Amino acid sequence: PFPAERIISLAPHATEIAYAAGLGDKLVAVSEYSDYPPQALELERVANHQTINIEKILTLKPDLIIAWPAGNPPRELAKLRQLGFTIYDSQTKTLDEIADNIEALSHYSANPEVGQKAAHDFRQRLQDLRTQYASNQPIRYFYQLSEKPIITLAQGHWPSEVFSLCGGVNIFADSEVPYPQVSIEQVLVKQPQVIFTSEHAIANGHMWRAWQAELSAVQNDQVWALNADWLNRPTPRTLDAVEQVCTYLKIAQKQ
């Protein structure tokens, strides 16, 4: 396509993949929470979970925008397309798509070998992890994005695929929306073998201690925090989430 000179990222994960793809030096704006690699804190922000700042983007004249269709507002992305910007749509469902993203984005780099290498390395480590964590048996898990309200994941949407590599089975897989709000009772009824939550919830005392009697996951000491930066952004660091998730689901075979 062409070595881009003024690149904008509309998502935290997209900023990580941009740096891995050898584009980081050409970024001129990123999203809120684009905090990795940490120098990205230095760049101006043009997007958050509710709004893309199209005025500022006009002001910046990007020759490449790295979009996150799954998380960005559809109307504003459509506007950017209608305005004639060159846009790469980052797809964010599978683990192999992370490497695909990096390899695609490397086409816009002045040094495509960087992204070529990063994708190669990702693919090899992903292969290593698939081999290493095959022995895991199916475990039914609950993954909490928040305690108030309880939001979880469903329909195979990200990060469902991280868990599935390890044999993990989402208790809310068959929900009518991809990120459903669920009640305490809904979880309690479902009887997850493992509960995954945030480091914050653990540190403060997690909400499921009160429910030890009704939750085998609590009796068995299988409520664990996951690193949300690794897990919920599809990036090279997702392979550390794979390790973390897979190690915990391995432990969960103890009974």
Residues 6+ apart with CB under 8 A from 165: 95, 129, 130, 133, 242, 245, 246
Closest CB to ligand CNC among residues 90, 137? 90
Angle formed at CA 201 by CA 196 and CA 203, multiple of 5 degrees: 115
Q: Are 20 and 235 in contact (CB under 8 A)?
A: yes
Indicate the DSSP class of residue 30.
B
47 binds ligand CNC (CB under 6 A): yes
Minimum CB distance to ligand CNC, residue 48 (Å): 4
Query: According to CB under 6 A, which one of 7, 9, 13, 141 is a site residue for ligand CNC?
Result: 13
User: Cα separation of 51 and 95, whole Å?
Assistant: 27
Considering only 1, 25, 41, 49, the residue that binds ligand CNC (CB under 6 A) is 49
* Closer Cβ to ligand CNC, 3 or 178, answer by number: 178
Q: How many CA atoms lie within 13 A of 45 on its CB side?
A: 12
179 annotated as belonging to a binding site for a ligand: no
From 116-124, 150-158, 183-191, 210-218, span contacting ligand CNC (CB under 6 A): 150-158
Q: How far is the CB of 90 from ligand CNC (least distance, A)?
A: 8
Instruction: Provide the token pair at 159.
Output: 């990060």
Among 43, 54, 71, 186, binds ligand CNC (CB under 6 A): 71
What Rg do the C-alpha atoms of the chain give, in angstroms? 19
With CB under 6 A as the contact rule, the residue among 4, 7, 8, 11 that binds ligand CNC is 11
Crossing angle of the two packed helices 12-20 and 96-106, in degrees rounded to 10? 60
The alpha carbon dihedral of 158, 163, 183, 208 has a sign of negative
Q: Taking a C-beta distance cutoff of 8 angstroms, is the pair 170, 154 a contact? A: yes
Query: Could you say which of 28, 43, 151, 225 contacts ligand CNC (CB under 6 A)?
Result: 151
Q: 207 in helix, strand or coil?
A: coil
- Out of 135, 146, 183, 253, which residue is the one contacting ligand CNC (CB under 6 A)? 146
* Span near ligand CNC by CB under 6 A; candidates 29-37, 54-62, 113-121, 185-193: 29-37
54 is an interface residue for ligand CNC by CB under 6 A: no
Binding string, residues 80-99; x marks residues near ligand CNC by CB under 6 A: ------------x-------
Lookup: tokens for 156: 């195979």
Q: Which residues bind ligand CNC (CB under 6 A)?
A: 11-13, 31-33, 47-50, 68, 70-71, 92, 145-146, 151, 157-158, 179, 228-229, 232-233
